[PDB]
Amino acid sequence: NNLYRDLAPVTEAAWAEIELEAARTFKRHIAGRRVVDVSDPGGPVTAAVSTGRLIDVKAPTNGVIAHLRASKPLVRLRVPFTLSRNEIDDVERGSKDSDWEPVKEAAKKLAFVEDRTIFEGYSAASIEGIRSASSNPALTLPEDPREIPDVISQALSELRLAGVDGPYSVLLSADVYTKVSETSDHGYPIREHLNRLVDGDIIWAPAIDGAFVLTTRGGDFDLQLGTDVAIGYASHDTDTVRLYLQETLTFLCYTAEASVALSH
Amino acid sequence: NNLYRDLAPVTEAAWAEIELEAARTFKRHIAGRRVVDVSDPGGPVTAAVSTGRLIDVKAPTNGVIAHLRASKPLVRLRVPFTLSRNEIDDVERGSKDSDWEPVKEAAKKLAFVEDRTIFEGYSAASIEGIRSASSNPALTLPEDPREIPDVISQALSELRLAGVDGPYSVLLSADVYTKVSETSDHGYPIREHLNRLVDGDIIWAPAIDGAFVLTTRGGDFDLQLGTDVAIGYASHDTDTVRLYLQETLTFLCYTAEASVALSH
Amino acid sequence: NNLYRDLAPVTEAAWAEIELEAARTFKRHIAGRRVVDVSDPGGPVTAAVSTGRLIDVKAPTNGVIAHLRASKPLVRLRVPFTLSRNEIDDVERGSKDSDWEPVKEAAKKLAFVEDRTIFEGYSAASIEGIRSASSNPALTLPEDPREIPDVISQALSELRLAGVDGPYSVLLSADVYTKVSETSDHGYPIREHLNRLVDGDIIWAPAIDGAFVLTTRGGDFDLQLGTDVAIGYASHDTDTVRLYLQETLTFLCYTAEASVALSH
């Protein structure tokens, strides 16, 4: 296929450790797929997702009414990374500490771009994120982290006022997640106060800004995958192998009132 | 074998009580084997652990490229102890309080050396401990023990920032473990506050200095055993038997970001 | 694996002729494996050979006796060679005289380095050769080749005085082997006089200096192989393919009195 993995000077044993480090780092830093509906991958051919809507377009002849079918394009996101060939060759010799730091940086970079796309949008790919598509009022996060469980309760009130009924999850940015993990009250971290407000999870979301409170009842948020994360080969020289991680996706939000966005 | 146990003036009943006291005291004072991967014992022959790496070495002839295979030597750690022969002979007569205090001191001594080796290093045996091999920033322990769950939360933040994903355990030195056990807050000991920060265990580590927070996801810390703890015979006279405890091991840390070291 | 043979622009038919020329030239120029015990290859992981001995090392704590396990490192010996791609491509077209001269030079180079290592030592790899480890007195080779069977008989006397009992082989350097092959006495070459002194073989050893007389009773000389001779791929351009021969080994001599070294 287009990955051209068989052309890489990378052993089968070294691929297994690269695949492990990429999958483990990506899953650690992905927060969007824990709350959105993730489709089955459509394959390499699929290029657009039908929205079912119509666009008025000028008729080619009188007596004819013409409409373009509306769709959302998929975006191919590629993160290159460079591995040392000495570190690759050490794997068959029995090394357990080969430097897969460029794999982990690329998986963290690809996980951030996917979560920035879902929550903050990526407008060049015609992706309105959850923050922009939310019709609930955007709340402000207080600087005192002990006041955060009040504002999360205010976000849960807006979802209750909007009429949505599902288990709620709270996604926190890396700064806010740290701040509620390290600040205590009544002998409990603030993050444990937040656990008891919601039936879903308090989710570490290191890509996003601020916070999000949303329902995970299903059918509101759609991550449409063309192809999921794959590792491909670009080139190599004597010392290095140029690889990449890539995935093809788009994100669709169908319910504007299913989420509350929070920021500073 | 080399233990020469059959030459000892030690009865079978007395061996069973010596083996029991040594195993119970060693397991009580070992903290490293609760968090590191412990290999199967390689046997008495094994002398080195391959690191899989290569060392540049001068070629014997031009047109030849030579590399030494790198490895880590195992270290044989022996702790002698002396038992009274009157206490040994009392066992067959039905004594239940024979003085196995030199067994317990030797097992505690051998357990401390193993845990100092894993965590603080033993540089003459080319063993970089967990504290020296950690790439996360070293935190300072506060003198007020009620402020310890904040600094443990700061250590958990560094591991979350490093990207590692497993159940975290906290290893406390004997001074710190006592101080968080004897200080209370909200009607709970500080050690119980620490239990609720982590999904792993709060571990009494009487050999180490300060504290350690690390993941136990697996594959990061490797205790390679040549031979595990065995009791051997050295010599005897009319009144005493000279014995020893010994084990052959080395320790390897493969993941620098899998641990946070804490000290005063 | 690390050889990356599938990336080479070398046909299956051309590999078969390269493998044949490398194996035939290596076996022609190897003399050490005819007299030493050659182990089964330990695999790519193995990095050291246990000597079973102990090294005094400073104890980490009082009351503890520490010893490092001693071992001998394996050395990876690589000989690069460059083949013409026109000569490679001629093989499928039915050529029988493709220039495998760089293969034969590399196999001769790798065979010499292995035999210099066994007999003359390679001290950077901590390999004491047979000549240095021999405790028998070193004899001098006479300039008259007709006087060589006397000095070989003197070497056989030293082995008889040392008490060793096995079939003796004589290894001659390329200069000495030529000189005893081309000089005649009583209508026989001097090499045929040497054949009748020993029950083993008179062995052409083109790598070594001088001569060696040793027993092949077994258990005295140990060639420990990690991986045996393999052909790997480095790189290629339009005109050439860069390949290499490599093997990983060390040599151990266990019996100092099992050999007599001879020189000029």
From Swiss-Prot, chains A, B, C:
Quaternary structure annotation from Swiss-Prot or TrEMBL: Multimeric. The encapsulin nanocompartment is formed by 60 subunits. Monomers form pentamers which assemble to form shells. There are 12 pores where the pentamers meet as well as 3-fold axis channels and dimer channels; none are larger than 3-4 Angstroms in diameter. The N-terminus of the protein is inside the shell, the C-terminus is outside.
Other observations noted: Stimulates a strong IFN-gamma response in memory immune C57BL/6J mouse spleen T cells, recognized by monoclonal antibody HYB 71-2.
Disruption phenotype: A single enc deletion survives less well after 3 days in 2.5 mM H2O2, pH 4.5 (mimics growth in the phagolysosome). A double dyp-enc deletion mutant cannot produce encapsulin nanocompartments, cells are highly sensitive to H2O2 at pH 4.5, mutants exhibit significant dysregulation of redox homeostasis, survive less well in C57BL/6 mouse-derived bone marrow cells and are more sensitive to pyrazinamide treatment in infected BALB/C mice.
Family: Belongs to the encapsulin family. Family 1 subfamily.
Gene Ontology CC terms: encapsulin nanocompartment; extracellular region; plasma membrane
Annotated Pfam families: Linocin_M18
Designated name of the protein: Type 1 encapsulin shell protein
Post-translational modification: The initiator methionine is partially removed. When isolated from culture filtrate isoelectric focusing gives 3 bands, none of which are glycosylated.
Function noted in UniProt: Shell component of a type 1 encapsulin nanocompartment in situ; its cargo protects against oxidative stress at low pH. In situ and in E.coli assembles into proteinaceous shells about 22 nm in diameter with 2.5 nm thick walls. Cargo proteins are targeted to the interior via their C-terminal extensions; empty intact shells can be isolated in E.coli in the absence of cargo protein. There are at least 4 possible cargo proteins, DyP (encoded in the same locus), FolB, BfrB and Rv1762c; DyP and Rv1762c have been identified in vivo.
Membrane topology: Peripheral membrane protein
Subcellular location: Encapsulin nanocompartment; Secreted; Cell membrane
Subcellular location, principal: other
